[PDB]
Design a protein around this ligand. Structure first.
Ligand SMILES: NC(=O)c1ccc[n+]([C@@H]2O[C@H](COP(=O)([O-])OP(=O)(O)OC[C@H]3O[C@@H](n4cnc5c(N)ncnc54)[C@H](OP(=O)(O)O)[C@@H]3O)[C@@H](O)[C@H]2O)c1
Ligand SMILES: NC(=O)c1ccc[n+]([C@@H]2O[C@H](COP(=O)([O-])OP(=O)(O)OC[C@H]3O[C@@H](n4cnc5c(N)ncnc54)[C@H](OP(=O)(O)O)[C@@H]3O)[C@@H](O)[C@H]2O)c1
Ligand SMILES: NC(=O)c1ccc[n+]([C@@H]2O[C@H](COP(=O)([O-])OP(=O)(O)OC[C@H]3O[C@@H](n4cnc5c(N)ncnc54)[C@H](OP(=O)(O)O)[C@@H]3O)[C@@H](O)[C@H]2O)c1
Ligand SMILES: NC(=O)c1ccc[n+]([C@@H]2O[C@H](COP(=O)([O-])OP(=O)(O)OC[C@H]3O[C@@H](n4cnc5c(N)ncnc54)[C@H](OP(=O)(O)O)[C@@H]3O)[C@@H](O)[C@H]2O)c1
Ligand SMILES: [Cl-]
Ligand SMILES: [Cl-]
Ligand SMILES: [Cl-]
Lengths: 329, 323, 328, 328
């Protein structure tokens, strides 16, 4: 009898998640039918969107999420035993799939690149950075780009794509270790927004003439400050607003419209899965090539043990992670 | 010659009041240049924001249609000029823009300050380039009985769009229903703005021409369709606002709907684009496609009252002061 | 007999403007038995009118008190020539059956303006008297913070505080008002509009903190004062004029952690709570203190009933030094 | 001897999470003469720890009180077996010289849990007692609004109000808490998280308004209650838990025009203001009311010192019905 472990939402989140909001459960998977495969999670991801999306779950439901898995049992010759796939059964160690909701990893994947990169730099967060910067911000080279949560999965890729396109990049991060990381990736200016005396003065010193593009992952009052330093016709890619995801009171004041209008800002939000097919596969091939060419470096914040997946999720929300947060099954 | 000028005596706290202004009389020097007599002056919301950058004693800023009274600018010529809130001014001849060569005698000269002027250009580029309507969309427009808003709704209608308009009085509702706006409501008297917008367009809104901002816009944003476009033209609900700025739109909604929100300034468009827009606006006015209405206040001495009344919704159409 | 009346043409949005008011003329009917005909001598304008006007319907007469003279009388208790306080609103003439009228103190001298019955020896003075002596409960030797301190209420609060043995810190909005309160003997006076830091000015004024806070202003000003209240300090919430003309949400409240740790008492009051013997005794004390020079008065007189809206609006904007009064 | 201690690993942002705390083991120092070794039997978690943690340095022990027993004694006043209240923080074992310890009431009976010395017959119960009987000044027949009414303080407030002859309206965060307080005899109880309109619900609960408001919550909730206070209504500002875990800006303050029109008295207090005979008398009254059944006790017991952070976070989020207690 094939068994699985599953993390469920015991209680809807109030502020930051805590341990008591999750419940680990064990169950037996049904026998494998023809055309189906048994998938064993190798790496699971935790992601900020899970904090926003959990409100649509019912208590008792499995937490949503993607994973890299390997076929351990196969009644499907297209997915033979040993095949590596991306699947989204949620926070579970094993699952059954008929193949229609799976994705194989890029065919040209070298043995030197961790499979877990398919959940990060050469995965959904890397595609978020890719399309957000190149199509929503529309950088053509030479722009000054501000990016926050810059040492995270999305932000670290944003800055490095911007650098290879010829941009100046200013990155905000929450720890001194993250400062060193991004200065090693080539960021032009990197500062710890939690320890600077004034965010406003720090951003002005980093780019006294303002910012052409703002890849916004944080929202809130941080973004109000950046908006006051956007150049005329500046573009904001509204990627996320993680300062608001765990919020317990009211949203903060909005960006002051008189500045937005006088600077004629263009602020567009996007979802990474707007792009599919040709587009998404081509972007993944670019990200992989750039990793193999050394133009995109990566770091992973790997937490060992499926039983520590809630801890990985809460740690990521608190800024513990340098790079993509991953859970090794 | 003599002149009268309105100056900022005290910086505005909330809405202006009469004591924040001061009328001063002075003696213009003899020409040694042209002398211009104000015929029609305009008051506009931007003056509330721009006055914060003035010093107490400076003349209020503003545009006017004036006539020469004393060779390329002979006596009797009509010109747009922006010497501020004043009845008479001296010009070197370079800061003046002449009305369209084909300005017919069938439309008031004051339209050069409204529908065939800066407000009409704001509605034109805001709707056609920023929102980018092509026909068939559902457009939400607030301050819809004002100078910009009423032109936005009429352009949207001649492009084949459904137009939902919000105004602050029942008289403005009646006027816009005669103009043919698909749905018009008084936002000050509806039981629930959210309910009214849902009934006006159960499908949602493709475009939002935003003149108001604030909490009104947070509600509209909750009913934008996916990939909806918001033209951030103004935020009049914040210009005179005491206290802290209102919350912004919920980011979860902006992101899930993948909204594009772009602000603009009418004077971005210069040269050929500006002139083509003015000639489209004038053609639509002569064809009847854009009806015009002006809120004319008689007397230069009532200019502060016209400005304050406009900020508070007294005006139906472009607020104009006849000197 | 004709009368002029100021009516509310449009409800206020932000500060009142001229267009919100409309002057109307009418003819009053003949007197019935028991009634009198009053001619306004002095009318008052007060901050409360900005708050209470929201209760009016457009067309209604603006509310307000006045010192009036009986010019025709079918009321034996109110013969021709009698001076009274009446509240018919902003009107030059009115008819009264007598029951809503108040005679001035029988001991009222001819050496002081009649208009003090609308100020220091009237409703504002009573507001200062009971707000300071009963709500704050000053007992002698305390440090008192009072804002709008050059106004009808504030200037009396500080002077009563002085003659009780208190130190008085006063906040005002102009240097002219600073000079006036320095003449009245305020220990510390400052212009809250020009100081670099309100917090630092209040710390320097009283390093020890404040025992009592007579609050006329509210808003952020009061949040700063509350951060410097001593333990068990008392706040008399008299007004909140910084909010009366507001167009958006109120500013944040006082930080509750400070209110609780300092165990503050914050009590609001309305002057008309006190009646009968208590009210009469207060009026006799105020009059006595004025005749003895212990309470000096200053009036901001505006001539002409036609300028009453302008007097109301100037007062709201802080142009008045002392009680604002309109001479009919 | 060894001890386990919970320390603040990281300052809280919003509500705490588990990784903000860190459990450390250490060897206690030897017992000097006059000292005792205390073993925790029951520890409390309280809302004030969220506010007070802001002033700790990372690495510091979390503050808090406990019921402890003397397990080793060099102090003849505190022999082995003695039960004491002590405040060494979140720790299983501690040393004391006896000066900071409080013995239980001489008349404490064996029929009630010792953990009531941390709740109803302890600091939360004294808070309710003095806040209602001295700050609100309940005299019988008033209508009292109390929020967090199913918590340690609030549940005692409502039951004292009932035995003093008052009508009690309580607000709580769950249907189970509504049902429990209805069982105790609260006149009206509602779930503030699920009602369509807080304003409408409060008006239905007491159409004539409220004489007294025991305020544990503050924020927007209190602004709504203040709009329904009767004239001369009294507010006991006990806490403001809606602000303790906030991240953005404080909410608007109460509308001063309503505060002034209704002439409200709003006084904050700290339970430790009352000492000596007054405190001992209140404790004896609370114990008598428990033994008589007029104050039914209810504890939300969490087993295991290792679960103390989760008990604290659960209490802050409304998990607790009654006083939150950790059984060592
Ligand atoms: N629209 C889309 O399709 C899409 C897809 C994926 C992700 N996203 C968004 O992209 C952003 C990053 O996602 P990710 O997967 O790359 O996560 P990540 O950056 O790897 O982890 C989240 C990071 O956010 C920072 N953070 C947390 N709370 C913060 C606060 N209050 N203020 C400022 N920074 C805070 C922390 O870094 P510091 O130490 O720098 O604070 C933390 O490490 C999120 O907003 C997410 O929702 C959007
Ligand atoms: N970006 C640009 O280039 C540009 C250029 C010109 C103007 N603008 C903007 O366009 C807008 C309209 O300008 P306009 O010249 O046509 O003025 P208008 O609409 O003719 O007059 C302003 C109108 O705004 C409304 N209003 C005032 N306060 C309001 C509030 N708190 N909430 C909602 N509506 C309120 C009133 O109408 P109701 O009775 O409907 O309230 C009033 O009649 C303003 O925001 C202005 O700044 C932008
Ligand atoms: N509770 C009662 O029974 C009662 C009775 C009467 C009056 N009151 C209150 O007492 C206060 C004083 O009334 P009053 O008759 O003596 O009027 P006043 O002080 O003679 O005139 C009002 C004054 O308030 C000041 N002010 C206006 N806006 C302000 C702002 N935003 N911030 C700070 N100060 C501001 C101005 O002086 P600066 O130049 O100093 O700004 C102005 O001179 C008012 O709040 C009124 O409602 C209460
Ligand atoms: N001044 C003093 O000397 C003193 C002494 C002790 C305590 N206090 C205060 O008294 C209050 C109660 O303390 P306690 O020990 O009895 O705690 P408690 O009520 O046992 O627990 C706190 C309760 O507050 C409620 N709550 C939490 N967040 C809330 C919010 N945002 N809005 C409304 N209710 C919320 C929750 O119950 P629901 O299910 O009702 O949400 C929770 O169960 C606190 O404010 C505390 O600071 C003051
Ligand atoms: Cl710029
Ligand atoms: Cl008792
Ligand atoms: Cl927990």
């Amino acid at each position: 009898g094939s068994m699985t472990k599953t993390w469920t939402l015991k209680k809807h989140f109030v502020g930051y998640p805590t341990n008591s909001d999750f419940e680990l459960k064990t169950s037996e998977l049904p026998p494998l039918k023809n055309g189906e495969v048994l998938l064993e999670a190798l790496f699971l991801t935790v992601d900020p969107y899970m904090r926003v999306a959990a409100k649509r779950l019912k208590e008792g439901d499995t937490m949503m999420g993607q994973q890299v898995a390997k076929v351990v049992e196969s009644k499907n010759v297209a997915l033979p035993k040993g095949t590596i796939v991306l699947a989204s059964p949620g926070w579970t160690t094993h699952s059954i799939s008929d193949g229609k909701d799976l994705e194989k990893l890029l065919t040209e994947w070298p043995d030197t690149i961790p499979l877990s990169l398919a959940l990060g730099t050469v995965g959904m967060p890397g595609l978020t950075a890719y399309f957000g910067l190149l199509e929503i911000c529309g950088v053509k080279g030479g722009e000054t780009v501000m990016v926050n949560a810059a040492a995270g999965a999305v932000g670290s890729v944003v800055g490095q794509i911007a650098k290879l396109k010829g941009c100046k990049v200013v990155g905000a991060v929450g720890s001194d270790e993250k400062v060193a990381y991004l200065q090693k990736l080539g960021f032009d200016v990197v500062f710890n927004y939690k320890t600077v005396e004034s965010l406003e003065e720090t951003l002005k010193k980093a780019s006294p003439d303002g910012y052409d593009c703002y890849f916004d992952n944080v929202g809130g009052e941080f973004s109000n400050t950046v908006i006051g330093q956007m150049k005329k016709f500046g573009r904001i890619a509204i990627c996320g607003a993680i300062s608001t995801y765990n919020r317990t009171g009211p949203l903060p004041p909005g960006p002051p419209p008189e500045i937005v209008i006088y600077q004629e800002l263009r602020m567009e939000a996007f979802v990474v899965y707007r792009w599919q097919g040709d587009a998404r596969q081509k972007a993944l091939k670019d990200l992989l090539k750039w990793v193999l060419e050394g133009k995109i470096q990566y770091k992973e914040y790997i937490i060992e043990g499926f039983e520590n997946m809630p801890a990985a999720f809460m740690g990521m929300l608190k800024g513990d992670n340098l790079g993509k947060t991953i859970v090794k099954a």
